[PDB]
């Protein structure tokens, strides 16, 4: 008696559950398109393991609602991205920066489009996207916060940018905050990443007079079985139904004093 399976193998088994190791990448960096995370595009997982050594190496960005985005993206278990063609007439696309490097060249997030002025005219943008697919879509966009009024004017030809992302159930409006703020990766400007769920039969509406980090499409979202886990335990070649941040564990004994965080069929401590 008193058998609670008090030991772990120290590693995580890649079977039967399809394990995906983020390594130097977090879920959000691979979600956005950080150059170092380009190998993660359109890839599926049953469990996604974030590492403590992960870091960002693109443009400094914040995600205000970081927890729910990270959870619900991992719940669907897929990074499958479907490019959509928005009608961005009158603006300049494919904005690049020096802090975000692809293949020895300046670039930006792979799934985001950084819109600037076209011949110093940045018109009032009104794009409507229908989503007639039988499934909830996930759109990811952002708001650029220039450091000075000079950059605001040189980037968008508009002193007071405004952004309104709307659906038939929600409406999101963001105002950029220009300010003298320190550098991050040698960049004083910053971006705030936001998301919007578009249910089937509901049209996506986006109004933006400036500072719009435009989306390039959507992700397939669903409250599935897959999940995410923070763990530094290496991924090994073995088979185990139960997985914890401390490693994989046999599910034979009824309880488990290893870790309150488990994935799969586990003995419920």
């Amino acid at each position, epitope marked *: 008696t008193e058998l609670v399976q008090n030991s772990s193998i120290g590693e995580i088994c890649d079977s039967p559950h399809q394990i995906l190791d983020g390594e130097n990448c977090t879920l*959000i960096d691979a979600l956005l398109g950080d150059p170092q995370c380009d190998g993660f595009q359109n890839k599926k997982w049953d469990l996604f393991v974030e590492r403590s050594k992960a870091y*960002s190496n693109c443009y*400094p*960005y*914040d*995600v*205000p*609602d*970081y*927890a729910s*985005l*990270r959870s619900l993206v991992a719940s669907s278990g897929t990074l499958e991205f479907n490019n959509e063609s928005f009608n961005w007439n009158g603006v300049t696309q494919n904005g690049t920066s020096s802090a975000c490097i692809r293949r020895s060249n300046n670039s930006f997030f792979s799934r985001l489009n950084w819109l600037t002025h076209l011949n110093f005219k940045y018109p009032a943008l009104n794009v409507t996207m229908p989503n007639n697919e039988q499934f909830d879509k996930l759109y990811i966009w952002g708001v650029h916060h220039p450091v000075t009024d000079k950059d605001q004017i040189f980037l968008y030809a508009q002193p007071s940018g405004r952004i309104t992302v709307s659906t038939k159930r929600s409406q999101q409006a963001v105002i950029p*905050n220009i*300010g*003298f*703020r*320190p*550098r*991050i*990766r*040698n960049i*004083p400007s*910053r971006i705030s990443i936001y998301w919007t769920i578009v249910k089937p039969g509901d049209i996506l509406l986006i109004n933006s007079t400036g500072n719009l980090i435009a989306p390039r499409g959507y992700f397939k979202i669903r409250s599935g079985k897959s999940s995410i886990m923070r763990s530094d335990a290496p991924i090994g070649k073995c088979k185990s139904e139960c997985i914890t941040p401390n490693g994989s564990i046999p599910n034979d004994k009824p309880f488990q004093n290893v870790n309150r965080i488990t994935y799969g069929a586990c003995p419920r401590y």
Partner: antibody
Amino acid sequence: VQLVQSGGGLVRPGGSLRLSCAASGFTFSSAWMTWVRQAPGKGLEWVANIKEDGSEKYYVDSVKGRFSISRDNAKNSLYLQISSLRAEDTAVYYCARRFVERLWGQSKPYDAVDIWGQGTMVTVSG
Amino acid sequence: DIQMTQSPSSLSASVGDRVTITCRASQSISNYLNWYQQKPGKAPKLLIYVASNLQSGVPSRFSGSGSGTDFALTISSLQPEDFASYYCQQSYSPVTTFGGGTKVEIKR
């Protein structure tokens, strides 16, 4: 842009003194604001924090109950009421604009000074 | 609540040497570190933001590193104008304190 101070000088120990710090060149009502001191020839020491709305105030332990930070958002000015002066309060009290924000959706946000004032001497002795 | 310890208190290096300053604290802070520079008799200057990120007017020879509780400010080629007292700020909730200074001298 910079800050300007006034209200420093000699005060007998046990006396009171009021420091003022006027602001210009930014949105004052949307940034944390601080007071930082260093004794002559010594290192720097944090003193006080005040929130953008003036709701949450944080002090170093040696000044609790004696100092009180405050601010006016309609104008652009900080205040550091300083009562019950002790001899170890002799220092050049700087005025910083230490703000804070989340850098990658973090639970707790990273902070640093925004800029520094020049600081006024606040000596205390009979 | 949480206190630091800088090392050394004062040092002496030559022009072109690689000098480093250590900055340790109680709890595990990770990225929540900033570095400062007081030009003598002047106000402090933002040097490094979040352990490693350099700032405006910061020469290329400065570099910060570390995580958790062990942090280092490194000058890759010390220069005459680098004479200053260096401080390292902790981004705890209240900014309790930040380390007692490190005073560098060109000494040549």
